[PDB]
Design a protein around this nucleic acid. Sequence first.
DNA 1: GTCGG
DNA 2: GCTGATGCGC
DNA 3: CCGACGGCGCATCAGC
Length: 327
Amino acid sequence: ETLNGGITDMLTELANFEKNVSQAIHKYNAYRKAASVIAKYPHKIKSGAEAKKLPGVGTKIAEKIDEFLATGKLRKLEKIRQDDTSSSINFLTRVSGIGPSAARKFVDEGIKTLEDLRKNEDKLNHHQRIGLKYFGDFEKRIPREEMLQMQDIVLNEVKKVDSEYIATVCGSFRRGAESSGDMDVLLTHPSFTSESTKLLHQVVEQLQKVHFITDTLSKGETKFMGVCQLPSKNEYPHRRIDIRLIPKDQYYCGVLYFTGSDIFNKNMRAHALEKGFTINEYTIRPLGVTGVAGEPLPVDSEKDIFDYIQWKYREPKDRSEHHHHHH
DNA sequence: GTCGG
DNA sequence: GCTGATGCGC
DNA sequence: CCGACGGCGCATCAGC
Ligand SMILES: Nc1nc(=O)n([C@@H]2CS[C@H](COP(=O)(O)OP(=O)(O)OP(=O)(O)O)O2)cc1F
Ligand SMILES: [Mn+2]
Ligand SMILES: [Mn+2]
Ligand SMILES: [Mn+2]
Ligand SMILES: [Mn+2]
Ligand SMILES: [Mn+2]
Ligand SMILES: [Mn+2]
Ligand code: NA
Ligand code: NA
Ligand code: NA
Ligand code: NA
């Protein structure tokens, strides 16, 4: 199935360990980068040397690849898997609301299992209460077929609140994925621009009023994080939904951001820094001589952003990650 | 952990 | 109130 | 203790 899959899984496992157990956020990103680059490499890897040529594979990862190529495993990962404290910390971070820091506190207080975690609800904040409540459903992927029915509801209900709203389903759906992990809804309204001043609320209560949104993780004036569910013919899993209100006049920088992937975005924002610019979901600005962002540059399309940084435009579908296959 | 300066 | 970290997530 | 690594919304606490 997956060309070099053994290696990329290995590197993914290490990344997760550095993040969740070591709290080494930059080592985590080194391994992710490594995993991404190898996955998109179109040849089989014969050695750590070969791999090392790829940007973001260095000495220590080559070594590991050698070890893995030679033995079909990695001793560093055997020791880690066996370490039950590492394994429970890792596990707890898969609940939404719990990161490396809380997962560690919980495990050092004898909370190690799903069963233990439910026993100690009173220890959890609201966000964690809800991620635990839907832990199972949130592990499932969303078929594009079901994404369409959700778009239909979201779009219809936005129009019914105020037809001047425009709602756009971004994330992995806009990239054409046949399944998505969540639903990312990007929202504009002409009253909200970068120079103006309860636009997101209305939409959320409307979506709750017709019982599509079922819970709330967090909510502010511009970003809503919650749970949703299709009505049953006769039940559908609950699902994560992200609703983002961005300023009407910065739609392109915002839709670029909200389309992802995550890895595409940090690579893009990294390539810009070396060219001399800084990008966020609102603007692309030139970095001053002192690394200080200057005034925003004009953007009339997604391609204008790529253009400023001397990148070839890439349609949404080519902003996903890929892997390659062996026979 | 990698890169680069 | 304000600012500024830290934790968490996308 | 070579240093930067993407960038920021929401929740919370700390120090003023
Ligand atoms: N680290 C991240 N940086 C980003 O810019 N993003 C952006 C913000 S919103 C857009 C989509 O994020 P999601 O986490 O919903 O990821 P996705 O839709 O690509 O993937 P999925 O199908 O939701 O698993 O990507 C996400 C990150 F995780
Ligand atoms: Mn495949
Ligand atoms: Mn294989
Ligand atoms: Mn490739
Ligand atoms: Mn205890
Ligand atoms: Mn998504
Ligand atoms: Mn999302
Ligand atoms: Na390299
Ligand atoms: Na988590
Ligand atoms: Na308790
Ligand atoms: Na459920």
